[PDB]
């Protein structure tokens, strides 16, 4: 540390090369046609969201900053189903969702084209495709249950309100087995990157961070990395294949997540009762017991429409 | 890049395409106006 | 008196003067149409009852 | 005016222009399709004097309801 | 007065100006379209004497 | 680097002429307007 | 005072100034637009004697 | 006192000073604007005697039993 | 960068294009005001 | 007293003075129309009952 | 890198543009005041 | 006494003095219009009943 | 840079002439205004 | 005592001093502004006898 | 900045301007006093 | 006593003195206008009934 | 490099004058604010 | 006695003394206006009912 | 640098004179004020 | 690094500025006390 | 650095004189104030 080198002519043969790696231009941050369109479409999505949020505090710029994390652009009302809603009642929402979705897909194309231009494997766009898959289930599951009202509101705390209410509506998402699997891969991704980051830093003195050299021409840094884990837990990866474990654990997080969302409300409407059926639910002693009259008295109603009048009670 | 006379040539098509596009848009608006005026 | 124009481009002068006059004349007509009640009396003359 | 293509690479400009026209046309069509007066897919066959006027109220529909009947 | 273009690259100033004006035009149209008085897609055919005004009706 | 003094001397004479022409046409306009709807 | 432009590059100063002025002007317009008294898009036609006024002292 | 400008860069102190004064000026205006007495955009046309004033100590027993608002 | 006369040529277009756009916007406001005055 | 103009540029002086005169004249007219009840009497002369 | 000659020249425009901006803002304020006073 | 101007710039001094006078004069007139009830009596004389 | 003394002397003569001419026209305008609607 | 400025650099200390005083002054003003007794923007024109006082002991 | 000879010329006009301004203002106040005396 | 000015800059002295005089005079006039009931008695004289 | 002492005196003279001129207009701003709506 | 000034700077002394006097005089007047019934009796002398 | 003794000598004369002039005008102001509305 | 000659001159200003600040703050406190005492 | 003994001799003389002038003025102020409103 604190003996930095500084390179005046271009590294890659501080500063950066202007040049080519074959088809790939080097120098500027690569956009291409798909990147430019992605930024245009995505900018309009961001603008629609922000202008709707700002309009919802009556254009007040102080309240716009003060209340920002509570502001929402909110999906359509439920009784429209999949029909086009009024502009102020979710029409802007669906428009922002459309441009955001196009922008994401154009960004995927931009990444896919750049990987091929740099003569690299396709691993990164298929990893990004797993994230896009989960994102798209927030469109397809509302579609499969038949109403755009079930979509996720654009907003910091509002989308967390939706996340809680989704688990409530479908009877506790902890008992969704694909949610449980998605968490196992999310935690496993933290386990792996902690283990791997610490491993490579522990052998960095021996050139272990030069992972491509260690893959093509195994050094003592790779050998010590393999022996540490073999001696610790009885089995080991290689300098290459640890990156496959990493890749699959990240990818399976959003892939199993997306399946869990698609199943919810379409195949299972109450995951806790599915858990009871399949033997997941641990028994506890009863906290209360209803009499047969209470079983009729304490059933409620399903929630209906809001009252559209202001009754007088003149009596 | 591009030479000036080569830019002149390209500009003529850009003007022509823009004019043709604005013409189609003008007919589209007058059809829409005759169907359901907005003022 | 003429040499105030030295160093200037006549096309910019004509552009600034031209655009000033357009704005001034449009403001004056919008204002005048309000005070003088014309074309409001023109419209009423030919309006269908 | 042609020298604009000497300042800006037309190959870059045309992509931005097409992108701008694409988002603009799509915004306007979605705006109209969500309006009352111009929701032409549902109501395009109405005559001009039958079409909605003045329907600008922000909550024209109930916000809260069950989903429509599933079958 | 033209030496401003020796001081700044006009190739960048024009992009900044065009981007600023495009965003500003979009903001103003959105603000108006969100209003009641200028909700012109729904109410543009109303005459100015019966367009909305931000006041409460007298004597209720 | 714009107009030289003889360009400016030429340009001034035309600008004076155009301004006088504009004011003359406007003087007829105000005379007609006063006859139609006097404002004092 | 013109020696101040020797101490600060006007390329830097004017970009900062134009950015500041544009942001400040937008903030002021939107503060006015969201007030009762100056919500001119809805109520600009009212005339000063019947524009809103914030409530006088509770001790009234 | 001028030797302070040997101790600090006179170019950079100016940027620090203007930045400080701008932030302080904005903070004081927004503190005032959010107050009731000095919400001048809504109530600036009020005379000083009729501008709002914050709550006061009752200057009494704070105990005298109430009477209903006249019907 | 630019030469001084090359900047002077650009400034001519830039100024005239600005004032042209302001003139078009002026008529747009004339039409909007005639349709629905805001004061 | 002409020495005040040395070191200045005549176009800058005309821009500065021209700006001030436009501003001063408009403020005076906006103010005067408020006090003198004109053009309000002009508008009332030609208004329709 | 400004010369003192360029700095003098630039300052004349900067003063003039500031004065033009202040003048327009002054007319804008007096229009606003006469339509709806804030004191 | 003239030695006070040594090392000053005339255009600074006239710009400062000009800014002071414009500010002072406007403050004084706006104050005076409040106290003297003028132009409020001028407006009343020509106001429509 | 800018104006020399000879330019300044020449400029000043027109500037004075303009200022006086503007004051003259304004003086007529005020006389007409006073005789139309006196303000004191 | 000026020998203390052979130990500590005036450049470092005068920045640290101005920073500390500015933070301390600002903390105290906002503490007072948040109180009932000294919410001077709303209540600064009340006389000392009229200003709020915190609750005394009842002792009964 | 101004030399001692420049300062002497500037002072002469500055005194002349100041005195003339005060003279005009004195007439303005006498007129104002005759119209609406304030004590 | 004049020795006190040695090593000073006279423009700073005139600036500091002038800024004190402005501040002092304004505070004194606000205060005096409060105590003496003037211009409040001036406004009351010319006020409309 | 750094600041030469004759430049520092020139800079200080401006800086102090500017500071005091700012305080002067802020003084008038408080004079106007106080007479519109005093805070004590 | 004068030896106390050796090694001081006269501007430092005059600025310190000038500061203390301005502080002391202001505090004494603010205090005096509290105890003596002045300017309160002055204000009541010219106040209108 | 700052003022020499000779500069300070003649500066002091003007500064004393200006102060005495300011006090003279203020003395007339108070005499008129006392005549108008005495405060003791 | 600094000389004692400079340290002498610095400390004089430093202590004088401390005194001026303490003086102003003392007037500020007595004004505040006179307006609304906290004991 | 700082003031020498012969400077300090001269400075002390003025410092004493100023203080005596201040105390004389303040004595008149208190004699007038006592005559106006005795505080004991
Ligand atoms: C009360 C709340 C509920 C609950 C409700 C939900 C719901 C509802 C969901 C999850 C989901 C997830 N939950 Mg759970 N969850 C709860 C409790 C937990 C607990 C815990 C300790 O209790 C944990 C660790 C988790 C963990 C997890 C993750 C495993 C999983 C999300 C994976 C992922 O990467 O998403 C983050 C990744 C994404 C969202 C992908 C985004 C990719 C796109 C392409 C990014 C675009 C960016 C865009 C261009 C940027 C600009 C945008 C504009 C600004 C708008 N939950 C309880 C039971 N949980 C999700 C899931 O898969 O469920 C099965 C899901 O939908
Ligand atoms: C070509 C060089 C100059 C020019 C030269 C002239 C001349 C010469 C004349 C005018 C005239 C006018 N111009 Mg011009 N004018 C220019 C740029 C402008 C711009 C602008 C946005 O830059 C504007 C708003 C104007 C506006 C105007 C009006 C004030 C005026 C009335 C006619 C008119 O508007 O016709 C519509 C014009 C425009 C919207 C401008 C663009 C059109 C073309 C490219 C330029 C002007 C053509 C001119 C009007 C034709 C004159 C015919 C004569 C018989 C020779 N000009 C260019 C930069 N202009 C006339 C006048 O003074 O009438 C009182 C006149 O005789
Ligand atoms: C394997 C599962 C995990 C995953 C993976 C993942 N995400 C990825 C990738 C991968 C492998 C990418 O390669 C991709 C990427 O680009 O990464 C940097 C991406 C990405 N993951 C993202 C976010 C993200 N990922 C998340 C999660 C996850 N990502 C999972 C945990 C989350 C969560 C937890 O909520 C978020 C929010 C993005 C940072 C990025 C995709 C970026 C994208 O699609 O952008 C589209 C464009 C816009 C949003 C518009 C921006 C508009 C500008 C701000 C406007 C500025 C003005 C403009 C210049 C105007 C136009 C003018 C034109 C002329 C230019
Ligand atoms: C309602 O309430 C409120 C609003 C308050 C009411 C109050 C309103 C007020 C205050 C209004 C004030 C208005 C005003 C005041 O001045 C208005 C001023 C108007 C003016 C100045 C008009 C001038 C017009 C000039 C014209 C048309 C000139 C044209 C010239 C031409 C065609 C010649 C071109 C050819 C040339 C030059 C030769 C080139 C040679 C070359 C190059 C060569 O030879 O090289
Ligand atoms: C809640 O509170 C709320 C409600 C918010 C209340 C608010 C409160 C506050 C805190 C407001 C603050 C306001 C403020 C400061 O503080 C405001 C400060 C404003 C300022 C400074 C404005 C200045 C504008 C200046 C302009 C426009 C200049 C333009 C110049 C031009 C065009 C010429 C360019 C140069 C040329 C052409 C020459 C090139 C030649 C070259 C290169 C050559 O020759 O080489
Ligand atoms: C309502 O309540 C409130 C508002 C409170 C009431 C109070 C209001 C108040 C206080 C008002 C005060 C107003 C005022 C104060 O001073 C007003 C002052 C007005 C002034 C200064 C007018 C000046 C006019 C000057 C003119 C027209 C010049 C014309 C020049 C021309 C035509 C060209 C000259 C020649 C050139 C350029 C070429 C030269 C040769 C060259 C270059 C060469 O040969 O090289
Ligand atoms: C109401 O309740 C509370 C507020 C409590 C009540 C209590 C109030 C209190 C306590 C008030 C006390 C006030 C006070 C106390 O001291 C007030 C002191 C006032 C003073 C001192 C005023 C002095 C004014 C001096 C002036 C105008 C000088 C001008 C000089 C001029 C024009 C000459 C300039 C030219 C020069 C120099 C030549 C340069 C030559 C050069 C360079 C050369 O030759 O090189
Ligand atoms: C809510 O209740 C809570 C808050 C919680 C209760 C608790 C309160 C607590 C704990 C308070 C603590 C207070 C405190 C503790 O330390 C307070 C300490 C305060 C202090 C130390 C103040 C010191 C100020 C000093 C100043 C301003 C100096 C200015 C210097 C100047 C102007 C000189 C400028 C010129 C120079 C330098 C030239 C040099 C020459 C050179 C270079 C040359 O000549 O070369
Ligand atoms: C209400 O309740 C509570 C508040 C509790 C009640 C209690 C209050 C208490 C306890 C009060 C105590 C007050 C007090 C205590 O000491 C008060 C002490 C006051 C004093 C000391 C005043 C001194 C003033 C001195 C002055 C004005 C000097 C001016 C000097 C001049 C004009 C000379 C200028 C020339 C010079 C210098 C020479 C340069 C030559 C040079 C350089 C050369 O020759 O080189
Ligand atoms: C002037 O510029 C301003 C100042 C306004 C710019 C500032 C803007 C600001 C401050 C913006 C702030 C944005 C924030 C804070 C956004 C927060 C967003 C969050 C947290 C979002 C979280 C989740 C959202 C999800 C999952 C949304 C998913 C939506 C989907 C999948 C929608 C898809 C829609 C499709 C595919 C199609 C719709 C159109 C159809 C085909 C149905 O036809 C009608
Ligand atoms: C800068 C160039 C672009 C200018 C763009 C337009 C700016 C708009 C403001 C210009 C001046 C407006 O001028 C003002 O118009 C209003 C419009 O109601 C007129 O108002 C009057 O006539 C109209 C006619 O329709 C009636 O509806 C109205 O009841 C009556 O009061 C005023 O008598 C006139 O003084
Ligand atoms: C819809 C109508 C209203 C909007 C009009 C928009 C277009 C502008 C109208 C005026 C057109 C003519 O405008 C004029 O064009 C010429 C070139 O022809 C420009 O001329 C510019 O380039 C030429 C070379 O080509 C240079 O020699 C010249 O110094 C420079 O100014 C002028 O700067 C511009 O003032
Ligand atoms: C919008 C503003 C409205 C309110 C009024 C503001 C008033 C501002 C007062 C400005 C007075 C300028 O007066 C004085 O200018 C001169 C140069 O001209 C500066 O002089 C400065 O540079 C000169 C060299 O040129 C040095 O020798 C000198 O030591 C230094 O102080 C002074 O520092 C300043 O005191
Ligand atoms: Fe790795």
Do residues I39 and E41 lie in contact, with contact meaning Cβ atoms separated by under 8 Å? no
**Cβ neighbours for I7, distance < 8 A, ≥ 6 positions apart:** E2, E3, E5, E6
**Cβ neighbours for L14, distance < 8 A, ≥ 6 positions apart:** J4
Residue spans of alpha helices (H) in A146-219: 156-169, 177-202, 211-216
Residue A257 neighbours by CB distance under 10 Å: 23
Residue P29, min C-alpha distance to chain Q (Å): 10
Determine the Cα–Cα distance for residues G4 and H59; give it in Å rounded to an integer. 59
Residues of chain B neighbouring E38 (CB-CB closer than 8 A) = none
Which of A75, A76, A79 minimizes the C-alpha distance to A304? A79
CA-nearest residue, atom 30 of ligand 7: S18
With a Cβ cut-off of 6 Å, ligand 5 is lined by E 1, 3-4, 7; G 21, 24, 27-28, 31; H 22, 25-26, 29-30, 33; K 6, 9-10, 13-14, 17-18, 21
**Best residue in H32, H39, H41, H45 for a mutation probing chain K (most K CBs within 10 Å):** H45
Adjacent-strand bridge partners of A20: A25
**Cβ neighbours for B15, distance < 8 A, ≥ 6 positions apart:** none
Angle A74-A77-A82 from CA coordinates, rounded to 5°: 105
Classify H26 as helix, strand or coil. helix
Task: Give how far the C-alpha of residue O21 lies from the chain's centroid of Cα atoms, to the nearest Å.
Answer: 3
Residue L30, min C-alpha distance to chain P (Å): 14
Contact yes or no for I23 and C19 at CB 8 A: yes
Please name the residue that has the structure tokens 């200006």: S18
For residue A259, the 8-state DSSP code is: H
CA-nearest residue, atom 25 of ligand 8: T18
Do residues D2 and B11 lie in contact, with contact meaning Cβ atoms separated by under 8 Å? yes
T13 is in an annotated binding site: no
Adjacent-strand bridge partners of A154: A73
Q: Binding-site residues of B for bacteriochlorophyll a, please?
A: 21, 29, 38
What technique determined this structure? Answer: cryo-EM
For residue A82, the 8-state DSSP code is: T
Which of A25, A149, A140 minimizes the C-alpha distance to A86? A149
Residues of chain F neighbouring I4 (CB-CB closer than 8 A) = 1
Touch test U–Q: 3 Cβ pairs or more under 8 Å: no
Do residues D31 and A45 lie in contact, with contact meaning Cβ atoms separated by under 8 Å? no
Q: Give the Å distance between the CA of C21 and the centre of ligand 4.
A: 7
Q: Give the Å distance between the CA of E3 and the centre of ligand 12.
A: 18
Resolution number, Å: 2.5
- The rounded radius of gyration (Å) of the Cα atoms in chain O is 16
**Cβ neighbours for P39, distance < 8 A, ≥ 6 positions apart:** L35, O38, P33
Residues of chain K neighbouring M2 (CB-CB closer than 8 A) = 8, 12
Which of A307, K12, U37, B4 minimizes the C-alpha distance to R42? U37
Q: What share of chain F is helix, strand, coil (3-state, %, to 5)?
A: 80, 0, 20
Furthest-apart CA atoms within chain K: distance in Å: 48
Which of A45, A40, A145, A150 minimizes the C-alpha distance to A100? A45
Which is the closest atom of ligand 2 to the Cα of F22?
A: 64
Residue E29, min C-alpha distance to chain A (Å): 11
Touch test H–K: 3 Cβ pairs or more under 8 Å: yes
Asked if G37 is an interface residue toward chain K (Cβ–Cβ < 8 A), one would say yes
CA-nearest residue, atom 50 of ligand 3: A42
- Return the residue of U nearest to R1 by Cα: U12
Determine the Cα–Cα distance for residues A286 and G59; give it in Å rounded to an integer. 59
Classify A19 as helix, strand or coil. strand
- Return the residue of M nearest to L42 by Cα: M39
Residues of chain J neighbouring M9 (CB-CB closer than 8 A) = 2
Do residues Q18 and P19 lie in contact, with contact meaning Cβ atoms separated by under 8 Å? no
Judge if the beta carbon of residue A261 lies within 6 A of ligand 1: yes
Contact yes or no for D56 and E45 at CB 8 A: no
- How far apart, in Å, are the Cα atoms of R35 and each of R19, R39, S39? 25, 11, 17
**Cβ neighbours for A307, distance < 8 A, ≥ 6 positions apart:** none
Task: Give how far the C-alpha of residue F17 lies from the chain's centroid of Cα atoms, to the nearest Å.
Answer: 7
Determine the Cα–Cα distance for residues N55 and A248; give it in Å rounded to an integer. 65
Which ligand sits closest to the CA of R26?
Answer: 7
Judge if the beta carbon of residue I28 lies within 6 A of ligand 12: no
Judge if the beta carbon of residue A260 lies within 6 A of ligand 1: yes
Q: Give the Å distance between the CA of F12 and the centre of ligand 11.
A: 36
Which of D36, A51, I15, G33 minimizes the C-alpha distance to E29? A51
Chains with at least 3 CB pairs less than 8 angstroms from chain A: D, E, G, H
Phi then psi dihedrals of residue A21, to 5 deg: -110, 65
Determine the Cα–Cα distance for residues D39 and D28; give it in Å rounded to an integer. 12
Interface residue ranges in chain C relative to chain F, Cβ cutoff 8 Å: 1-10, 13, 35-36, 38
Q: Give the Å distance between the CA of A190 and the centre of ligand 3.
A: 21
Residue D17 neighbours by CB distance under 10 Å: 13
Determine the Cα–Cα distance for residues A14 and A16; give it in Å rounded to an integer. 7
For residue E45, the 8-state DSSP code is: T
Tokens of M28: 């007529």
Do residues A156 and A281 lie in contact, with contact meaning Cβ atoms separated by under 8 Å? no
Residues of chain E neighbouring I8 (CB-CB closer than 8 A) = 2
Which of U39, U32, H55 minimizes the C-alpha distance to G57? H55
**Cβ neighbours for Q13, distance < 8 A, ≥ 6 positions apart:** P9, P11, P12
Residues of chain C neighbouring J11 (CB-CB closer than 8 A) = 4, 7-8
Touch test D–C: 3 Cβ pairs or more under 8 Å: no
Neighbours of ion ligand 14 (CB under 5 A): A 211
T11 is in an annotated binding site: yes
Judge if the beta carbon of residue C18 lies within 6 A of ligand 11: no
Judge if the beta carbon of residue P3 lies within 6 A of ligand 13: no
Do residues A75 and A150 lie in contact, with contact meaning Cβ atoms separated by under 8 Å? yes
Angle between helices A177-202 and A220-233 (to 10 degrees): 130
Which is the closest atom of ligand 6 to the Cα of L29?
A: 5
Which of A149, E23, A167 minimizes the C-alpha distance to D63? A149
Residue G10 neighbours by CB distance under 10 Å: 19
Which is the closest atom of ligand 5 to the Cα of H25?
A: 10
Classify A268 as helix, strand or coil. strand
Judge if the beta carbon of residue A46 lies within 6 A of ligand 3: yes
Do residues J47 and C34 lie in contact, with contact meaning Cβ atoms separated by under 8 Å? no
- Return the residue of F nearest to C7 by Cα: F2
Determine the Cα–Cα distance for residues A266 and A142; give it in Å rounded to an integer. 10
Residue spans of alpha helices (H) in chain T: 4-35
Classify A26 as helix, strand or coil. strand
């Amino acid at each position: 540390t604190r003996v930095q080198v500084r390179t005046v002519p271009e590294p890659g043969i501080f500063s950066y090369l202007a040049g080519k790696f074959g088809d790939a231009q080097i120098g500027p941050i690569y956009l291409g046609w798909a990147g430019v369109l992605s930024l245009i479409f995505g900018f309009i999505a961001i603008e629609i969201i922000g202008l709707n949020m700002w309009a919802s505090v009556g254009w007040d710029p102080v309240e716009f900053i003060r209340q920002l994390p509570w502001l929402a652009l909110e999906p359509p009302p439920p009784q429209y189903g999949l029909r086009v809603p009024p502009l102020n009642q979710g029409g802007w929402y669906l428009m922002a969702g459309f441009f955001l979705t196009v922008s994401i897909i154009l960004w995927w194309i931009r990444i896919y084209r750049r990987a091929r231009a740099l003569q690299m494997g396709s691993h990164l766009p298929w990893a990004f495709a797993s994230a896009i898959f989960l994102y798209s289930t927030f469109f397809f599951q509302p579609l499969l249950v038949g109403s755009w009202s079930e979509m996720v509101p654009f907003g910091i705390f509002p989308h967390l309100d939706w996340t809680s209410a989704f688990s409530i509506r479908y009877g506790n998402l902890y008992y969704n087995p694909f949610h449980a699997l998605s968490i196992a891969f999310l935690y496993g991704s933290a386990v792996l990157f902690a283990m791997h980051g610490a491993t490579i830093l522990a052998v960095a003195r021996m050139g272990g961070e030069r992972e491509i050299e260690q893959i093509t021409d195994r050094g003592t840094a790779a050998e010590r990395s393999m022996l540490f884990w073999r001696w610790c837990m009885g089995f080991n990866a290689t300098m290459e294949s640890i990156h496959r474990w990493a890749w699959w654990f990240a990818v399976l997080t959003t892939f199993t997540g997306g399946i869990g969302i698609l199943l919810t409300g379409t195949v299972v409407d109450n995951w806790y009762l599915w858990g009871v059926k399949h033997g997941l639910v641990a028994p506890y002693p009863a906290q209360n017991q209803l009499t047969p009259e209470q079983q009729d008295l304490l059933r409620g109603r399903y929630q209906g429409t809001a009252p559209d009048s202001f009754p007088s009670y003149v009596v | 890049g591009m030479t000036e006379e080569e830019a002149r040539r390209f500009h003529g098509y850009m003007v022509t395409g823009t004019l043709g596009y604005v013409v189609v848009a003008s007919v589209a608006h007058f059809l829409a106006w005759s169907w359901r005026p907005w003022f | 008196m003429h040499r105030i124009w030295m160093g200037t481009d006549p096309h910019i002068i004509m552009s600034a003067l031209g655009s000033f006059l357009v704005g001034a004349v449009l403001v004056m007509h919008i204002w005048a149409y309000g005070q003088f009640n014309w074309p409001a009396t023109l419209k009423a003359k030919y309006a269908t009852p | 005016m042609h020298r604009i293509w000497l300042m800006y690479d037309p190959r870059r400009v045309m992509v931005a222009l097409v992108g701008f026209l694409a988002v603009l046309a799509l915004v306007i069509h979605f705006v109209l399709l969500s309006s009352q007066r111009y929701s032409w897919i549902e109501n395009g066959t109405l005559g001009a004097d039958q079409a909605p006027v003045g329907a600008s109220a922000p909550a024209a529909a109930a916000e809260m309801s069950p989903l429509p009947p599933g079958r």
